[PDB]
Design a protein around this nucleic acid. Sequence first.
RNA 1: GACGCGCAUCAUA
RNA 2: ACAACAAGAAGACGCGCAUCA
Lengths: 105, 71, 149, 1168
Amino acid sequence: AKHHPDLIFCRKQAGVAIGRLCEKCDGKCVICDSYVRPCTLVRICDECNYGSYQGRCVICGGPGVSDAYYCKECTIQEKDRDGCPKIVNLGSSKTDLFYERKKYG
Amino acid sequence: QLEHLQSKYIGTGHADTTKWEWLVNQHRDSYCSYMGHFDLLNYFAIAENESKARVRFNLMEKMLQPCGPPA
Amino acid sequence: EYIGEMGKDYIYAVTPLLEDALMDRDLVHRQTASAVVQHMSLGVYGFGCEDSLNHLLNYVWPNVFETSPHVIQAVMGALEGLRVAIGPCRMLQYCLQGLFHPARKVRDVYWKIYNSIYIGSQDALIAHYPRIYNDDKNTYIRYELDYIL
Amino acid sequence: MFLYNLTLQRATGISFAIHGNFSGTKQQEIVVSRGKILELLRPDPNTGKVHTLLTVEVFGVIRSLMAFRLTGGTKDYIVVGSDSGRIVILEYQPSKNMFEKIHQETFGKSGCRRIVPGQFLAVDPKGRAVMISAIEKQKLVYILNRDAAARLTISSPLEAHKANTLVYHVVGVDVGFENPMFACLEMDYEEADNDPTGEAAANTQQTLTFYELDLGLNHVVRKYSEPLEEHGNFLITVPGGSDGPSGVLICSENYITYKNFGDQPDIRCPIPRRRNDLDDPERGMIFVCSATHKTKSMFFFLAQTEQGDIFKITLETDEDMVTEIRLKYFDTVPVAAAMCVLKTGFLFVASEFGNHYLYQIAHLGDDDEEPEFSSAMPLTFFFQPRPLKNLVLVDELDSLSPILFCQIADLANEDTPQLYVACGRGPRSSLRVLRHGLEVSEMAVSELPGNPNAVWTVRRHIEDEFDAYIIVSFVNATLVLSIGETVEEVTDSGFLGTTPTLSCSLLGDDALVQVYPDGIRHIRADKRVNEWKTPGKKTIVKCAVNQRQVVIALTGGELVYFEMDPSGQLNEYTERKEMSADVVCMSLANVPPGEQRSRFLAVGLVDNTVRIISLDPSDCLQPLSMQALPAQPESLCIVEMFLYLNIGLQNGVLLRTVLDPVTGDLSDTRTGSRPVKLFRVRMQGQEAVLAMSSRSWLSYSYQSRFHLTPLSYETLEFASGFASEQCPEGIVAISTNTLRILALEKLGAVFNQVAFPLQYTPRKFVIHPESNNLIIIETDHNAYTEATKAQRKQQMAEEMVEAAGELAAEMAAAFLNENLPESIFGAPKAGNGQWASVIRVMNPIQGNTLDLVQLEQNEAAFSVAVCRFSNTGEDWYVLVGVAKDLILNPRSVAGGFVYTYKLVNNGEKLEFLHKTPVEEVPAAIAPFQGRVLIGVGKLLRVYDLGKKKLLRKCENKHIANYISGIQTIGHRVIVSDVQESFIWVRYKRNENQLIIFADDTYPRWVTTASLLDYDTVAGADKFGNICVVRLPPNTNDSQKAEVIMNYHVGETVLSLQKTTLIPGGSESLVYTTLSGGIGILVPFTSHEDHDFFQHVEMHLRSEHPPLCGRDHLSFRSYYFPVKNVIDGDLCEQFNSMEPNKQKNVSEELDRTPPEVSKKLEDIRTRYA
RNA sequence: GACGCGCAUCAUA
RNA sequence: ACAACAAGAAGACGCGCAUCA
Ligand SMILES: [Zn+2]
Ligand SMILES: [Zn+2]
Ligand SMILES: [Zn+2]
């Protein structure tokens, strides 16, 4: 996600697994969050696919209902041949939102 | 910090990169490019009367330390 | 972004507007103009319309020396989008001006741009490297390309 | 300003060759790999010939190629490592005859890089894993298995990275049902770049590490690290397990070392040297490539040295250890890139430069007279080269790989142009002439009186494999003949041809049918005459013979139907069709062996309306359909490989129509302006047609594709088949008042060639305008001239005499008397700054040499020109640029000279006139305005003729780099700089100065240039880029030039010329490459066609991805973006596409595949 | 450096 | 036991201005 600069990608050797996308983010690009012209399929490394992490969403982490795709611009720029797009950082925004949601109810 | 592509990759420079390092890196890249292609190798082996194996062996030797000794 | 390959016919119409917008008057306008340039350059790739694309680089380039993260990100994206459309030769020629400048921040910026150009299409830089004459101690001449049949 | 890329010849430079059972049958095949074209070919053990069965373009550089099979499998899967950042696995389908992708894994960026794997590819000999590696820091291993569905699978890659490591070679070690092992020649350089004293560069030995793949642990760990005493180049896998010990063989300079992990000691064996070698003793010896013949009983190895010597390496081993290594001289062959030792004693030699050879192993060299060598002998070995006497040559291929210079011009008396290519390398160089057509060979010559107009080829029986009778007919009489390998005139044939016979068919089992204008007589083998007199005074016009039917035609547009009845006699139907025109030409198809008989009939008329007649008795002699014809037809035929209808006309047009009750498609091309007759021929077991015109035409069907190529022969009048013991498959073609025999041995699709041998590598040549001769200059590096060789041999003989062995040395006379062939045993390579130059005058019509001029030992020729000076009269001068003591890498010039010649006797003799010194080597010489302009280094000068020496007039010093080419037109001169693209200079006459006004913006390593017109120049590049440069309209004769075209052929181009190829066609830009391919650039004729081609290319870019998974647009934009060029190679792949996908594309384009194919072929036919 | 106000960016959730 | 969830509302930034030490 380009909106949040603090997010860090896994950036490892992609395996043969297939990424998944939930209903909240269905047609978004895994890199630039675009909405036009899906091009290729997203692969992830075996570390991101083990036990409870199998079938989870790539960006946020919800249940997987659709496959992840690269847009045409990312394919032209060859940004897909980098690694798995799975985000390993939990994110300071989500935990903080949960923290001031829990106290208020 | 989305600069992971620059640090992990080999050959990328920075402010404290000397001229010798850049020159030797580009020389090694040029040698690899010469080795990869076939028509360039044919041109090199036709310009001087040698064989493809001999040219490849010489290119292997020239990759140890080009541009002379460092300063 | 939406039209894609259909932007080759309307590229002439928006050129004066982009030229006016890219002038140093506000940061947001320059950022949006850089985004427009990036998207258009990515869309029009593969048709051979660099005659008007090369004119916008002369205005995009002076905007690199900025400190705001958003505008520098937009300028970097525009430069990387133009790299595939215009060819790495022009970008390399632009970068070789102050690559070894006595200052430090300009050297950092130029080295970052050079690394960005170097990561993608590294093999294409072999034929565009400048000739550097050797000194007394070292040999900087690539004699393998001087052979004549 | 839009071009179109067409391809005529494909690359013939073999880089990688592999063998295996790819089809899955019991016959071995070879998959050769070109630079960017994948080819499959198999040899025929019966006839000893090699034929190509598949050719597909991958659009990318194939850096590696390997074959393997699974455990217990019967089929081989091809693994291809290309310049892209992915690895693919291919499988060959014999039924589909196409390559099918099985898997596709991406592991990095595309393009030839340093840390991207793909350069080295190794596979487990068992077939359980594959390994891919880069030049530095990156190695990857893929594990392969199969599921319960009997389909090949693949797992995730395993990282085996190692920082600061330079890999020289990667090879797989064979183990017996254990963890896979890989051996590589690692080499570290971290310390070499840290110490500036310089000793770190030296004494840095390379190691030999082993990598173990732990299947249970799913990781790769380094086992051992063994430093080497010297530097090696590549490794060989010794078979292990139950057949031989497990280990590797290391090849190095003058030595070979066997090494194994464990308690096995090292074995060192020297390499034998040639006796009385004339080479510099400082030069070493290395191996280029190796083979392996894993025979069930015992295995051996084959290796080749730099000089082409083949050795036979044999290992003698104990229960576990190896004792010694035995070497044996096998034969001598031209230097090759890789060998393939097939089963049943077939040896394939793929030469790196030149033709390719196929050798049959006749003897194994057992119990030879010459001794062997071994490592147990203390202390250097010598052997005497000798003729082969161990391999027999069977087949030769053709490859114009080292194309260095081309010149398209019309030199012969015939109006058609010819191509002159100065190809070849070293002593095997030759000057070849390319002509469009097929290879014509004369088999027999016979002169016969009269005016022959027809011949026949009739077998004795329908099941006979050979011909029986040959009938020759004249205007007034006939000449019956028989074939018995001593062909004479036969008398007891029982024909009595007093009148000219119109046809001699084979109707019955062993009977013949003759047609004469006075009636019809049946000629049965039994003495029976079933003569049918013609009612009335009317005569016959034409006939339609067949194996079961005979159709005739009478005057007044009337048809009479005859059918061969099973009873034994002939009967006539009770209906006679009447027409309003005259019979001109009609034809009948052959009977199908499976079905009853033919059904469609073709009838020609003066009204130019064809009528189809059903042959069934229920609706016999009834019209079916009609079709208008522009002109009066001359002949008709029905070709069968979905049949097609061939239409012949009295003018020069050939028409083809698909078989259909109603009229359909019609494709035609110019044939001319002469009557055309189409005759059936049988080539490769398939039917074909043959027409007559100004040049003979043949239309065959090869690989389910119809070709239309002419014959390189004079005019003819009739054609027929030929079958006998001397030539089982030939062609009988009578000529003007004589009998001749022709045959087609080679396929000879395009560009027939004839080779004239030379002695050195031809650099450049020119054409004499008056006498139409050639002035060829040649130059080789590391070469000796004749005088130097003679003096060196004399000095060696003197040293041998001075040795005085006990006087008793009588070998001096034998050594000085007997010499080895130069073209087979190679050349003596000795020296570092040596050169050799020869100037030759050659008659291009013949192969004879007219004049020969030799230069000094240390002089190298680089330029040649023919010029006329204004000060003199009609004198012809030849100028040659000569260098002195050139050192290649540490460049240094010790002067240069320019030679002048008089060219006495209109181009048949050269005489020396005078020399002149220059400060730098001259690279280009171009005459203009009655004077000669010579480029000396980075300076430009204008010279004039002088009694003592050339006189300088003008000089320029504003050229930045070394001048490599000069082009002159009108009053402007174009200078091709070595690194910059182009320089425009104008010459002032009154003031006498050269001024630079126009230049270029992008530096380009220009190799050659051409001038399309006054203001457009077409350049080239070392890497393969082709660009077109045009000056702006607002220029004053500072001012930059624009580029209107960019492309990337992918191969180095060394020639450019704009000329017309075929008569009656438009001009085109013909370019030749350094790999053997010939291509042209064609402009479009309209805008709708250009839009259609662009749409087709866009659809096929995404809908039909390339075979190796490399982006086509990115590949063509390899250095510069594509500009106004349409790739025809991608557009022409529509024919091999799936029928459903072809349909989908057609209705996406709102057209039909029959129309799309015609549109695609029209642009090729018009310009080629 | 401290206490404040206004405007504006990221198809931010 | 290592185990991810519900809409009282939040995450990264910048450009300008007033007062005080
Ligand atoms: Zn991951
Ligand atoms: Zn999601
Ligand atoms: Zn994207």
